[PDB]
Design a protein around this ligand. Structure first.
Ligand SMILES: *[C@@H]1O[C@H](CO)[C@@H](O[C@@H]2O[C@H](CO)[C@@H](O)[C@H](O)[C@H]2NC(C)=O)[C@H](O)[C@H]1NC(C)=O
Lengths: 45, 49
């Protein structure tokens, strides 16, 4: 019965979610970079 | 579509965003155009692939 009191810990499970969310947020943000080019919208160019 | 220079593709739908008389096109998080405002009617429309 004392186990619920200690809960109401799971940081190892939240870290897995965070690491993937951070890689997906970074992957999308890297599309707004010119890399020394003229612009970053394949249309403009 | 082309909205005064903005070249793209997508479906146009009625929006519920509010650009203030000084706003022309609110991009979303991750820096991609998500809404435009007509160039002679001032209607705000959402865009989506
Ligand atoms: C640019 O000129 C056009 C002329 O066709 C204008 O369109 C008209 O605008 C009036 C005012 O709201 C409407 O009553 C008419 O119905 C419109 N014409 C058509 C064919 O829809 C337009 O508003 C002008 N744009 C600007 C920014 O002045």
């Amino acid at each position: 019965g004392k186990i619920q009191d200690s809960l109401s810990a799971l940081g190892k499970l939240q870290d897995v979610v965070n690491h993937n969310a951070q890689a997906l947020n970074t992957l999308v943000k890297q599309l707004s970079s010119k890399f020394g080019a003229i612009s970053s919208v394949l249309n403009d160019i | 579509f082309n909205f005064n220079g903005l070249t793209g593709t997508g479906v146009l739908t009625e929006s519920n965003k509010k650009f203030l008389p000084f706003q022309q096109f609110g991009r979303d998080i991750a820096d991609t155009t998500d809404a435009v405002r007509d160039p002679q009617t001032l209607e705000i429309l959402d865009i989506t692939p």
